[PDB]
Symmetry: C3
Subunit: 27 residues, 3 copies
């Protein structure tokens, strides 16, 4: 329940860093 969200927040976190990166190129 805490670990679950733990590693989870670790993936949306990466996923997001990516989005910021690729979209930023798109501009």
């Amino acid at each position: 329940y805490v670990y679950q969200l733990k590693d989870e927040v670790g993936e949306l976190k990466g996923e997001v860093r990516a989005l910021k990166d690729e979209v930023k190129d798109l501009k």
Copy 2:
């Protein structure tokens, strides 16, 4: 405090899946 972040991580999580999707079309 844990539930709060719980359903919260459930929305940024979806929101993100969307962004990945729409932006990916943008490329």
Copy 3:
């Protein structure tokens, strides 16, 4: 461990609101 993810979920959360915003202009 809970606080850590706490403020963390607070940043991906903002970061994401931004992405939704800027990408949405991109369309």
